């Protein structure tokens, strides 16, 4: 459901705003079942569509986002979907150097224990970030 929610479900609903509590609960899901640990990754896409379409908000969005980044992210098959959304979020013009710096350093730390497929993703991803925010050449 979450995989197809953003594309094949939201555009066809009459009042898609009803889905947020489902999505926010999805985005905030924490469970002892490891297979459920990927839920925030999938729920993120649908949540962003709602936020974009009606100017809707999720509290402490980046702080929650910093938490979701973990080694499991580098190995899930949904890694490509996540980073695509990361490009949009981290293209924001009101991002501090420290906020960007943390995403940089954590991702580089994760690349040490990452598949080359993930590494191939991160190395250009990081070049875009460092290029966007010149102060981070330190």
């Amino acid at each position: 459901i979450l995989l197809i929610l953003h594309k094949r479900i939201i555009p066809h609903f009459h009042t898609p705003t009803k889905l947020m509590d489902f999505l926010t609960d999805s985005y905030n899901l924490q469970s002892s079942n490891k297979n459920a640990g990927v839920v925030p990754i999938l729920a993120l896409n649908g949540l962003f569509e709602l936020m974009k379409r009606f100017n809707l908000e999720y509290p402490n969005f980046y702080m929650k986002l910093y938490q979701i980044i973990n080694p499991d992210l580098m190995h899930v098959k949904y890694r490509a979907r996540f980073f695509r959304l990361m490009d949009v979020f981290l293209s924001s013009t009101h991002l501090s150097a420290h906020l960007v710096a943390s995403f940089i350093k954590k991702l580089a730390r994760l690349t040490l224990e990452s598949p080359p497929s993930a590494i191939v993703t991160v190395i250009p991803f990081i070049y875009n970030l460092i290029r966007k925010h010149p102060n981070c050449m330190i």
Binding site: T15, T17, K18, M20, D21, E57
Partner: protein
């Protein structure tokens, strides 16, 4: 003006007011509901208020943060006051708020000043009730009483003469 003439009554630009005017004395939309109340977005909240499903009403207010409930009560009074025809649906919202967050509402220093609009609003509907029952009874009896209570044959002389 003739001095014998009496001056006429004119209200002009005077402000009318009432004695009750105590101003100077899944499927849930909770997060949207909390969102609009905080930000005073009339457009956003009106969409939330458009739900007519009772189960949604309960679940949404069930999870709503109790402090935000109070401001919701105030705002429903205003929206009722402007549009009375929406009285029916909006009492339901005021009802489910009251029972769930009733414990919180007890632990509030003052209620009448912050909920004066509801009390005035709710009072007006009550003042109607005695009269409408009288109307219904009169309206009852009448319906009660009243519920209980060429060419084919034409012969044309002209056509006959013709044939």
């Amino acid at each position: 003006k003739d001095l014998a003439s009496a001056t006429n009554y004119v209200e002009g630009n005077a402000r009318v007011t009432s004695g009750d005017n105590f101003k100077h004395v899944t499927g849930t939309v909770t997060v949207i509901l909390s969102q609009a109340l905080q930000s005073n977005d009339h457009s956003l909240l009106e969409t939330v208020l458009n739900n007519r499903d009772e189960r949604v009403i309960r679940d949404t207010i069930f999870r709503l943060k109790p402090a935000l409930a109070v401001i919701l009560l105030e705002r429903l009074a205003e929206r009722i006051a402007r549009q009375t025809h929406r009285q029916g649906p909006l009492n339901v919202w005021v009802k489910w708020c009251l029972i769930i967050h009733g414990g919180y509402l007890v632990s509030i220093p003052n209620l009448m000043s912050t909920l004066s609009s509801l009390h005035s609003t709710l009072k007006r509907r009550s003042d109607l009730l005695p009269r409408l029952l009288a109307l219904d009874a009169r309206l009852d009896c009448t319906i009660n009483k009243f519920k209980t209570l060429e060419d084919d044959v034409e012969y044309n002389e002209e056509l006959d003469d013709a044939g």
